[PDB]
Design a protein around this nucleic acid. Sequence first.
DNA 1: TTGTGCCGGAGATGGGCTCCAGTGGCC
DNA 2: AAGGCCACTGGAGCCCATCTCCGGCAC
Lengths: 58, 124, 102
Amino acid sequence: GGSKPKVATPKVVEKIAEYKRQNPTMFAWEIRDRLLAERVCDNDTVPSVSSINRIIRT
Amino acid sequence: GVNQLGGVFVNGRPLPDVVRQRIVELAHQGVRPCDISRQLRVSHGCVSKILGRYYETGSIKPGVIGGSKPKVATPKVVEKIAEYKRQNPTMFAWEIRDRLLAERVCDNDTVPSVSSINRIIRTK
Amino acid sequence: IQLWQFLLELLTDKSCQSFISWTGDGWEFKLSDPDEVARRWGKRKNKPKMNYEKLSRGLRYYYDKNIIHKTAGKRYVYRFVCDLQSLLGYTPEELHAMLDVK
DNA sequence: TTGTGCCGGAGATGGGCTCCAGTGGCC
DNA sequence: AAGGCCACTGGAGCCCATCTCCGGCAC
């Protein structure tokens, strides 16, 4: 046993994929921007740029 | 990967020490950085970084990669845990967790987990 | 994305032909409107201050990487010298046909 | 040339990447 | 109860591919 997600929630992970659907030319910081504007994540629940790129790699 | 100069590189990893040494050696010999970059197939930005750091530090070593800074194991929280143990060596981790709160050294968000408290006890 | 790739993207899109197009000679291309091309590059990379001057320096940077060469005697005319055939899987005449290149 | 057009040197940027100290449920 | 175990985080430094500023050179 290791650990469970705190930011890479199934919902956030699905939206990121959806943002990559609209326009793959997005930068990590931009995904964080919309993921924050569409109120999909709280300023305290929003994945860090590193996590977003980790999510994308996974 | 292969950079645009045709050089093999490992994204995210430091240039091998042997290459780093050759960059400094060639500049020492009078080779222009742009020529060092083209001949060794390393971005001129990297050559620039390596040389700049060498003239400034004397070392060819890359910086220390990785790690993170403490989040709950704050310098004050750590000292408090030490003070609690010194006061009552038999006090349990969860009881320590409770006194940290009862004295307000931490919030319900700042308070270290039981694992962390024991880990803190064990390490520093 | 890299500059040379970005230009290729524009060159394989019919709606961009009024500002950048193949000259028909192999992999040679022309920046019919160099300023529109620079603006779009600036937008793609999030670089508000991009302009032709800097785009041009970017192209000069490709000269010794044997990625792109500049055609002499003309302005705004360059040529991909890397092997696009292998990358795209198309031949010059072949790609021009897919894009209705005069 | 007190300029234009082209060339190319090198410090500054900041993007995705690998790393890894730090953390917390679970047994 | 404390320790072993380990998926998950985010910021550290990395090299790259420019970005940017600018001096050279020919005319």
